[PDB]
Amino acid sequence: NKLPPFIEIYRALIATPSISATEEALDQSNADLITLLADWFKDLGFNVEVQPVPGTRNKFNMLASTGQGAGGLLLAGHTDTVPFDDGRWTRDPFTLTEHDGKLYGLGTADMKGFFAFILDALRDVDVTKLKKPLYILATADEETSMAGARYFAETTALRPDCAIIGEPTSLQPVRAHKGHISNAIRIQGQSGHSSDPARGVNAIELMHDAIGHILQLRDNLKERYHYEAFTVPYPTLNLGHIHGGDASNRICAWCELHMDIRPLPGMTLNELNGLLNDALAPVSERWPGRLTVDELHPPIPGYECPPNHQLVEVVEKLLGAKTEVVNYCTEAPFIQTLCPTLVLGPGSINQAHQPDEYLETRFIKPTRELITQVIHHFCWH
Amino acid sequence: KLPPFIEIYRALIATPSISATEEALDQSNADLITLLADWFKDLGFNVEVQPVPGTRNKFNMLASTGQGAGGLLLAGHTDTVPFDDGRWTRDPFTLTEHDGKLYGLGTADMKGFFAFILDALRDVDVTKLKKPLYILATADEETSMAGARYFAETTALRPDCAIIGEPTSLQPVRAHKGHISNAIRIQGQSGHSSDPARGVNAIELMHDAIGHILQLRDNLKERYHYEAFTVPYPTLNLGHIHGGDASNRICAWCELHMDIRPLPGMTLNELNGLLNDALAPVSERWPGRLTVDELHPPIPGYECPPNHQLVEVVEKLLGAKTEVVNYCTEAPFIQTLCPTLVLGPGSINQAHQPDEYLETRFIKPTRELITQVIHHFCWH
Ligand SMILES: [Zn+2]
Ligand SMILES: [Zn+2]
Ligand SMILES: [Zn+2]
Ligand SMILES: [Zn+2]
Ligand SMILES: [Zn+2]
């Protein structure tokens, strides 16, 4: 079975909905997308394994393999997209449309195009002639939980020489980014009429005490840790949303705060959890049982690719570009547990998750070239 | 799309290209050259076919891709030796597989090498190579080496390195001795044996020359050494002698046929001057009477330096260390252009033999060798 031309591959991927969401009604299975990729890889002569990802709403990972033995190259991407706002799109998000040197569609930039590029570059490559293995990972639920990548990293026996995750980086090689933890702090107070405030426990007052401690943690993070390579050098902590209480004339019976932290590479999740628990401890100990912490998504550590890796040397030379760091988060921390990993892909973060998302056609040739060249270097040598 | 390997090979074997000094058995290699030229053009090479001056309608082919300095030369001859039809048991020009062998004239020596180059190149995109690749196909290796001689005299190409795909069982050969064969001819002056003084006795003059030539033999054995060779010195052989009509006549003429096999590093000019120096007392005593004529075109010894990168690369790919051999190839002429190895599939033991073959076990390792050396010397 011959592989369709690049634009047809791209078009079919965009046309196959794969939105992930916390809300079940918006959370679409990536079964169709995964099978489409899996059979294209099978057609090119890869061994392909599709696995259900435990704990997801019917989502799957795909790993396509050619070759056996140590090392080789892993090319990795996620299959899901974010949802779309049909108020703000002006085209069908599932219809790949070329206009004014741009290819529009949901996931054109983030990040279905990367798979089209891989397949198109492999069009004629005889995988029987490779000397080291080539692996392609397609993951579930990157945009929500990262359960696909986490599950793969937890279970796989593979240890490649190196990996590239094709997130949109404008084909600039990214070697590090911050982590991401997002929590809801929930405080249960006691109701009562405002004519006698002392008679109950006021959840806003307790949340005030808690926020004091959380802001002291924010200050300590910022005072203690700095990596000026990041445009924001410190670990960040953001108070995003707060809600509680019925009415002005009633003791506030509950209050919830949603916050996040973006730790620098090198801080462990265990460390950071300890620092948050320590921060809240004075409140939890004064008011036993009343304060709880929930995660809004599973936590993700920061990451950094080590120096002096062939991957960097080769890619920097191929692109004429030095590695950069970013403040946002990817599956790289999970993949980096397996091998040295870069984040490198076509399209721009500026279009990711946006209405009328697109990928510029100018990325087509340089992306095809990069992929051909890294396969040659890491698999054909 | 090139035809599959076996069809390329069949086509080459099926196209007679026997070379011979006799005009009647000496076949043009034009048809063999045309097959290769058209296939290299199919692959996107620039192809030049040149007549080889002084031959019976023979040609050389050079297929070229890429621009600028260096690169890789792959070289072979297009001719074969003749066949003895009483000793063959299949048609020499019909490539036939039997029990892991491919039988036919030139299977081992050395048409297979071209089939392997074309087959290795079938999917290779030459437009992507960063340094040039050249394929040379020569005339008349098995007689005069006119093809290789002419190419080496005329080309401006200076590759980084070259391989000549003679059958070496895919073991790299980095040196061999030369070969010069001369007739020493002495003109005497006849007369009746009852009065020797009235003539000039060519056997007596030849006796003086032989003494000088055996002294040269002794000098060559004493003063030049190359340990790797089974006979580690330059050899000199007196093979044939003939002169005179009768016991009762002064011997009016005498001829001696001899050969010398010099070591790598001795030039033909150096060797010629040693021989001329040895003969000088005789030619000076008897001006006009002694001449030296070549019996075949002289071949210098050859070597590639053992530490060259081409040696390192091939020794690792093949798991076989470099060797030296006692017989001749075109390597001395190609070595004038660039460091050169002799390395190819099939065995020397099948070369020029009845029911010549190349074993099929050579197919996969030869394809891989060619692919790897093109990659190493041309790709980046
Ligand atoms: Zn993404
Ligand atoms: Zn995203
Ligand atoms: Zn290479
Ligand atoms: Zn030969
Ligand atoms: Zn021969």
Numbering used by the authors:
A (entry chain B): 3 to 383
B (entry chain A): 4 to 383
The authors write:
ArgE is a metallohydrolase in the arginine biosynthetic pathway that hydrolyzes N α-acetyl-L-ornithine to form acetate and L-ornithine. ArgE is present in all Gram-negative and in the majority of Gram-positive bacteria. The first critical step in bacteria is the acetylation of glutamate to form N-acetyl glutamate, and the second critical and unique step is the deacetylation of N α-acetyl-L-ornithine (NAO) by ArgE to form L-ornithine. Therefore ArgE is required for cell viability, making it an attractive antibiotic target.
The two structures show a dimeric protein present in the crystals which is likely to be the biologically active form, analogous to published data on the DapE protein (Nocek al., 2014). The protein monomers consist of two catalytic domains (residues 1–179 and 305–383) and a dimerization domain (residues 180–304), with a small hinge region connecting them. The zinc-binding sites are located on the surface of the catalytic domain within the crescent-shaped substrate-binding cavity, and the zincs are coordinated by H80, E169, D112, E145 and H355 residues. The first three residues (H80, E169, D112) bind Zn1, which is present in both structures, and the last three residues (D112, E145, H355) bind Zn2, so that D112 interacts with both metal ions. The occupancy of the second zinc ion in the di-zinc structure was less than 100% and was estimated to be 80% based on visual inspection of the difference maps and refinement of metal positions. The introduction of the second zinc may be due to differences in crystallization conditions such as salt concentration and pH, but the presence of Tris buffer appears to contribute to the binding of the second zinc ion into the protein within the crystals. The Tris molecule directly interacts with five protein residues (D112, E144, E145, E169, and H355) that are involved in zinc binding and also with both zinc ions. One of the Tris oxygens is positioned between the zinc ions and may stabilize the second zinc ion in the active site. Upon examining the crystallization buffer, the Tris concentration is 100 mM, thus acting as an inhibitor at this concentration. The Zn-Zn distance determined by X-ray crystallography was observed to be 3.38 Å, nearly identical to the Zn-Zn distance of 3.39 Å determined by X-ray absorption spectroscopy.
